[PDB]
Ligand binder design. Structure first.
Ligand SMILES: C=CC1=C(C)/C(=C/c2[nH]c(/C=C3N=C(/C=C4\NC(=O)C(C)=C4C=C)C(C)=C\3CCC(=O)O)c(CCC(=O)O)c2C)NC1=O
Ligand SMILES: *[C@@H]1O[C@H](CO)[C@@H](O[C@@H]2O[C@H](CO)[C@@H](O)[C@H](O)[C@H]2NC(C)=O)[C@H](O)[C@H]1NC(C)=O
Ligand SMILES: *[C@@H]1O[C@H](CO)[C@@H](O[C@@H]2O[C@H](CO)[C@@H](O)[C@H](O)[C@H]2NC(C)=O)[C@H](O)[C@H]1NC(C)=O
Ligand SMILES: *[C@@H]1O[C@H](CO)[C@@H](O)[C@H](O)[C@H]1NC(C)=O
Ligand SMILES: *[C@@H]1O[C@H](CO)[C@@H](O)[C@H](O)[C@H]1NC(C)=O
Ligand SMILES: *[C@@H]1O[C@H](CO)[C@@H](O)[C@H](O)[C@H]1NC(C)=O
Ligand SMILES: *[C@@H]1O[C@H](CO)[C@@H](O)[C@H](O)[C@H]1NC(C)=O
Ligand SMILES: *[C@@H]1O[C@H](CO)[C@@H](O)[C@H](O)[C@H]1NC(C)=O
Ligand SMILES: *[C@@H]1O[C@H](CO)[C@@H](O)[C@H](O)[C@H]1NC(C)=O
Ligand SMILES: *[C@@H]1O[C@H](CO)[C@@H](O)[C@H](O)[C@H]1NC(C)=O
Ligand SMILES: *[C@@H]1O[C@H](CO)[C@@H](O)[C@H](O)[C@H]1NC(C)=O
Ligand SMILES: *[C@@H]1O[C@H](CO)[C@@H](O)[C@H](O)[C@H]1NC(C)=O
Ligand SMILES: *[C@@H]1O[C@H](CO)[C@@H](O)[C@H](O)[C@H]1NC(C)=O
Ligand SMILES: *[C@@H]1O[C@H](CO)[C@@H](O)[C@H](O)[C@H]1NC(C)=O
Lengths: 938, 188, 49, 49, 49
């Protein structure tokens, strides 16, 4: 039978205590929702693939055998026995002997890793769906098979495989939840975000590659064996003065027969390994032969000094080849060699002469050197490897004359001249190739690759996901192809709405109606057609007062990192080694200190724009305007406004130091209180010098007059305006008391600085190539000279992490400074005055603005005027009264059909056309659209 | 095709053009009103008189020089076409942005052709010529330097993106102040 | 080379993060510049300006 | 190096040491007497004039 | 005039530092290139350089 493993078989991977952390670990785990084999006993000879999960629900426990292989483990319900020998009521297990000490859902996990037999278990009372971690048990020392014996109920058997998991430890340090990473795309998203909750959006989780199907080894049709007998078995070797250079080219060389031969004393290969020599193709081979003394055999090597190296045979530093030496004490004053030369020999240069004797250390040694040339010129000599038949239009692992690579081979229209063997591109990568066997040209294209992204709504809403394979044509993977790639798991909809999740190329995705993920082309907005005519105007008759919040970052957390601590934790040796790198870490400290100072300057520039600390009067008679929600209240300990508190609740030891800001939050709040009091009681006057008091309903009339609305409008709609403003201020509280997404611009600033720091600290856990990431471990395991190398390796990389961090912080601080300068400009122009700049101090005609402190930022409540109820009218640029044209002094002419009036342009207030609201210039024969109407004379 | 991927912009060119068409239609048919809320229609010759009144010229000037003003504007618009149909040097600020991103990428790809002290710049060549322990050293040598090329590229891109963001913020401000309204700021 | 690259830690999760931030910021820039209009206005067929 | 203090952390009786977000040894178990000791790095900080 | 003076100073300190980085070994036997080239052979001097 069969059943499902509902997130079972999860165990503590190690003996480390972790609390309140989501830790990602990858090892042998039981996959989530895998098919686990049920059994009912009556033997079943199961395998041991990599590890066995084992659940059980019985008292009987006739599962009394654990055979491997010989390893034979027995767990007899009272005593554990382990017998490792060549084995072949009753003991019929078979035809070192360790012994350990003498209604329920018993869970067990067995694995054999690195000679360790690990048992994990959880005996819990009563597959049941749920979650339960498995604590360890006895770990034994010491095999690919399994058995259960039935010595004459329900048990389930899984099979662990290598999987990555994201375990969630609670405050008590026990695992409460886990995520199988490679189960579904949503779990991959959870892994990438290191979180159990995912917000709505698009997340790059992984990358997608088309794997090669088969390998194509393609070598030329040559079979003549290379002449290696005639340079190794030659009767007479030339003397080391004139070493005999014999060229080998255009043949098949078998280097294995030379290597496996035991006649050779030393076989030292530089730049290649002797075992791999048969897999390679060389453009040219040079075999230089000679004879020397036994003690000079070490001098035949790159970068060696001695008489032989400098005067007789000089190998270059970048010598790719092999050196073969055998003691030939069988075949003497016939070995001339130079002893005195006026300089050192050039590499591979042949030219006072001495001739040491030989009487059968001082023994003769016959040596040859095989200089290879691994250029990209045409390969001539190759190994004995066979040439497979080629395939095309398929991602394969090709090998043309040692030119390895991966890609699809296609027929090419490229015309190769008949001496050209391969082609290149701008990138200097092998764009084409010529097949050695048949002289044809094949284009190389790397087979498809690209990132894969997961379209998801918030996990609160659903667990549905779509998957975007970016920039692939998924004939190579319902299913819908787009210009941004292709999307699976989401259906195409011909409608068009506002973008919810951006895919790209005009495509967005959203979770909508059963509910599913739909993909569509974004709609840029509601279609509107303006009823434009050359004599019709639209005048507003009413208006609204709108309060909109603009959030601006101002500063970020001041930080300072001592290099000597971060790189060299209280270590003298590492400090002395760090001094060799000069003054990197005086200047890193200087940079971070500059950033920190700049943060205080940013806050000073934004908030300290007021000379004095103004205070609002105890009596609050502002013409009906209610500022209780933004003015400070003395009842609270921190003298913060209601909205300020709502904002301050919506934002959340390795040489690191976080310096406190110079201005505490209470004092930022005091600055903002002063600005509010000045704006309310004095208007824009307090920014231009001394605060000149004025009733609020009057500076409001001034501010209306400044947007083109005459001041009688305010005094005639005082109560309506006050009620509108109060309602808007109330709506701000509702927008901020429920939704935390409005503060994101600040939250990111808090998050970016955190992620940057955590990363930095985590870079202390990396080896960077060294034996260990812990400095004291290296210093306690190694001597001084050898530890110096590893410590230098660590410094080079911890210093690089610091440089990366500081560069990121400098760039981010530049961004924050730009935002703070903008915020200072808004405070100067939107708060200390009213701005005629459009869409600067909010949308609409700006009336005023209110600052509110926010964590590492500021919030401007922009109070704006928005005309509301338009009405059509017929209009005319001018009026002909008595042969003379009258133009509106301030406003525009309108008509309700019968009479003609002149009205201001932002509020329908019609008036009788007289000689004081109009001015006369010219005659009515040049103006286009002028109409006939009487102009009253007072 | 070396791990590089160029993602498409979210807004296609047709749709940028649709946005600009909408802005032009609003400016022509409604003036600055469509930026402050609902688009209130007004004859073009009138919002033009408003705009003259906003620079200190009374509005009879426009109505008495309507045809002259229209002809002057039409001639200027015609001259723009001649300036752009023959000379490509006016667009340089954009062209550099296209070039800088190209040169940065090509350089990056070309850094894959460098040894960085190793025996070869091709990873498979090292893996096929050397054993595991000796190839480890050379591969580490290559990583240290390919990673450095990436860090250099990303730092350059971050700085350049900061510059582009500054320019885009300026362009947004101009659209808000120059298009959605008329600006008293001098030489802005 | 991947196993060897793991010894350098998380340089290349953060490099990807940086480039992704740049790419997102580009779309934000275009949105900020051009999407300043609530509706898609259309000019009338008659052009009498 | 650090100060050893008594810990309220509850170690399960197979756990020999503890860690934090930084993957640094936040706690330890004494081999001789089976008790838990919190590790805190002793005080450090810049000095300014 | 400090805003200008700092600009003059920052460019100076950056340059001096750069020049002073020529006096550092960076792990080599010496910071002077000609000294290495005059003390060591080609193959061994290659490593230090
Ligand atoms: C065979 C070797 C064997 C193993 C591996 C084993 C594991 C094991 N069983 C336990 C509980 C227990 N184990 C059993 C009995 C069994 N549990 C089994 O896996 C089997 C096969 C039996 C015998 C039929 C019982 C009855 C308890 C106590 C549960 C209770 O409170 O009633 C415990 C917890 C002990 C403690 O700290 O209190 C362990 C570690 N017990 C064994 O005897
Ligand atoms: C302008 O709009 C306001 C509302 O925005 C109107 O005031 C409303 O009037 C109705 C009665 O006509 C009341 O029921 C509402 O309670 C009022 N709202 C507020 C906020 O006071 C006002 O009447 C409109 N003016 C004109 C001339 O139409
Ligand atoms: C300004 O608005 C606040 C609420 O935002 C008013 O405070 C309320 O006052 C009423 C009495 O009129 C109480 O019943 C409420 O409990 C109060 N609410 C809060 C949150 O304090 C305040 O009265 C208004 N100011 C004026 C002058 O009317
Ligand atoms: C057992 O698991 C396999 C693999 O998931 C699945 O195809 C099969 O349907 C499962 N069997 C049952 C009875 O669920
Ligand atoms: C687990 O954590 C809770 C947190 O509320 C705590 O009360 C409890 O004492 C801890 N220990 C156990 C065994 O529950
Ligand atoms: C032998 O070499 C020739 C030379 O091009 C080639 O045409 C032929 O296919 C080769 N034979 C085989 C069996 O590969
Ligand atoms: C040299 O000759 C011996 C015996 O004649 C033989 O065993 C050996 O393989 C030969 N070596 C070469 C390289 O030909
Ligand atoms: C994708 O593949 C199809 C079928 O091979 C082809 O017609 C199309 O041109 C390819 N490219 C696309 C859709 O961009
Ligand atoms: C959407 O429009 C395309 C246009 O070719 C059409 O083929 C398709 O049937 C339409 N789908 C629906 C659901 O209307
Ligand atoms: C003005 O007239 C046009 C067309 O006659 C109409 O579409 C529009 O709704 C009218 N405006 C109002 C406010 O009714
Ligand atoms: C226009 O307004 C005048 C004065 O208010 C009024 O007498 C007349 O009836 C109105 N006509 C229309 C069509 O509204
Ligand atoms: C433009 O206005 C003139 C006079 O003001 C009028 O004759 C003409 O009909 C108007 N245009 C249209 C399309 O009606
Ligand atoms: C306006 O009045 C003048 C003179 O009284 C006359 O010539 C002209 O035709 C009139 N136009 C209209 C549209 O009434
Ligand atoms: C010997 O080991 C036991 C085991 O915990 C320990 O309790 C005891 O203190 C040790 N004795 C000494 C002298 O340390």
């Amino acid at each position: 039978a069969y059943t499902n493993s509902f997130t079972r078989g999860v165990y503590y991977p190690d003996k480390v205590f972790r609390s309140s952390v989501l830790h990602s670990t990858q090892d042998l785990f039981l996959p989530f929702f895998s098919n686990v084999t049920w059994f009912h006993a009556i033997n079943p000879v199961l395998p041991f693939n990599d590890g066995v999960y084992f659940a059980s629900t019985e008292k009987s426990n006739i599962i009394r055998g654990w055979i491997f292989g010989s390893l034979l483990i027995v767990n007899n319900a009272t005593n554990v026995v382990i017998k490792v020998c060549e084995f072949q009521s009753e003991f019929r297990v078979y035809s070192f002997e360790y012994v350990s000490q003498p209604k329920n859902l018993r869970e067990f996990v067995f694995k054999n890793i690195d000679g360790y037999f690990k048992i994990y278990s959880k005996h819990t009372p009563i597959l049941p769906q749920g979650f339960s971690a498995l604590e360890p048990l006895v770990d034994l020392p010491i095999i690919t098979r399994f058995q259960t014996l039935l010595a004459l109920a329900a048990y389930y058997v899984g099979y662990l495989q290598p999987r990555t998991f994201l375990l969630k430890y609670n405050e008590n340090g026990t695992i409460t939840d886990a995520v199988d990473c490679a189960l579904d795309p949503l779990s991959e998203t959870k892994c990438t975000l290191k979180s159990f909750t995912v917000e709505k959006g698009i997340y790059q989780t992984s990358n997608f590659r088309v794997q090669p199907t088969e390998s194509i080894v393609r070598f030329p049709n040559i079979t003549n064996l290379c002449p290696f007998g005639e340079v190794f078995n030659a009767t007479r070797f030339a003397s080391v003065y004139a070493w005999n250079r014999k060229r080998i080219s255009n043949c098949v060389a078998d280097y294995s027969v030379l290597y496996n031969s035991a006649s050779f004393s030393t076989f030292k290969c530089y730049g290649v390994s002797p075992t791999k020599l048969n897999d390679l193709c060389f453009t040219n081979v040079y075999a230089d032969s000679f004879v020397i003394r036994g003690d000079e055999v070490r001098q035949i090597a790159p970068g060696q000094t001695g008489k032989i190296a400098d005067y007789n045979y000089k190998l270059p530093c970048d010598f790719t080849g092999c050196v073969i030496a055998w003691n030939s004490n069988n075949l003497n004053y016939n070995y001339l060699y130079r002893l005195f030369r006026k300089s050192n020999l050039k590499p591979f240069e042949r030219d006072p002469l001495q001739s040491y004797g030989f009487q059968p250390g001082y023994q003769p040694y016959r040596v040859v050197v095989l200089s290879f040339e691994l250029l990209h010129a045409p390969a001539t000599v190759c190994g004995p490897k066979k040439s497979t038949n080629l395939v095309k239009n398929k991602c394969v692992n090709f090998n043309f004359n040692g030119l390895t690579g991966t890609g699809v081979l296609t027929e090419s229209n490229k015309k190769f001249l008949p001496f050209q063997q391969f082609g290149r591109d701008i990138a200097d990568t092998t764009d084409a190739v010529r097949d050695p066997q048949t002289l044809e040209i094949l284009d190389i294209t790397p087979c498809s690759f690209g990132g894969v992204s997961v379209i998801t709504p918030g996990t609160n809403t659903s667990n549905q996901v779509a998957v975007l394979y970016q920039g692939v044509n998924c004939t190579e993977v319902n299913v819908f192809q787009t210009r941004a790639g292709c999307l699976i798991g989401a259906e195409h909809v011909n409608n068009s709405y506002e973008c919810d999740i951006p895919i790209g190329a005009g495509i967005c995705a959203s979770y909508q109606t059963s509910q599913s993920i739909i993909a569509y082309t974004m709609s840029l907005g509601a279609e509107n057609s303006v009823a434009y005519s050359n004599n019709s105007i639209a005048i507003p008759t009413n208006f609204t007062i709108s309060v909109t919040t603009e959030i601006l970052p101002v500063s970020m957390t001041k930080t300072s990192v001592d290099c000597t601590m971060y790189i060299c934790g209280d270590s003298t040796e590492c400090s002395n080694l760090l001094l060799q790198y000069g003054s990197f870490c005086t200047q890193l400290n200087r940079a971070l200190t500059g950033i920190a100072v700049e943060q205080d300057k940013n806050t000073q520039e934004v908030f300290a724009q007021v000379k004095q600390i103004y205070k609002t009067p105890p009596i609050k008679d502002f013409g009906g305007f209610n500022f209780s929600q933004i003015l400070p209240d003395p009842s609270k300990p921190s003298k913060r406004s209601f909205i300020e508190d709502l904002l301050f609740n919506k934002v959340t030891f390795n040489g690191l130091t976080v310096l406190p800001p110079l201005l505490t939050d209470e004092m930022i709040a005091q600055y903002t209180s002063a600005l509010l009091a000045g704006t309310i009681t004095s208007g824009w006057t307090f920014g231009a010098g001394a605060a000149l008091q004025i009733p609020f309903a009057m500076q409001m009339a001034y501010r209306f007059n400044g947007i083109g609305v005459t001041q009688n409008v305010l005094y005639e709609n005082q109560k309506l305006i006050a009620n509108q403003f109060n309602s808007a201020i109330g709506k701000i509280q509702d927008s901020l008391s429920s939704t935390a997404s409005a503060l994101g611009k600040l939250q990111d600033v808090v998050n970016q600085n955190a992620q940057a720091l955590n990363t930095l600290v985590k870079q202390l856990s990396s080896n960077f190539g060294a034996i260990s990431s812990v400095l004291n471990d290296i210093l306690s395991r190694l001597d001084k000279c050898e530890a110096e190398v590893q410590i230098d390796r660590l410094i080079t990389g911890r210093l690089q992490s610091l440089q990366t961090y500081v560069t990121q912080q400098l760039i981010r601080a530049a961004e924050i400074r730009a935002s703070a300068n903008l915020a200072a400009t808004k405070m100067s122009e939107c708060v200390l005055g009213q701005s005629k700049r459009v869409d600067f101090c909010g949308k609409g005609y700006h009336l005023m603005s209110f600052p509110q402190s926010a964590p590492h930022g500021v919030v401007f409540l922009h109070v704006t005027y928005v005309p509301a109820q338009e009405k059509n009218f017929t209009t005319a640029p001018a009026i002909c009264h008595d042969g003379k044209a009258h133009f509106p002094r301030e406003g525009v002419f309108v008509s309700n059909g019968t009479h003609w009036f002149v009205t201001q342009r932002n509020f329908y207030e019609p008036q009788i056309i007289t000689t004081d609201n109009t001015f006369v210039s010219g005659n009515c024969d040049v103006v286009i659209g002028i109409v006939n109407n009487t102009v009253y004379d007072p």
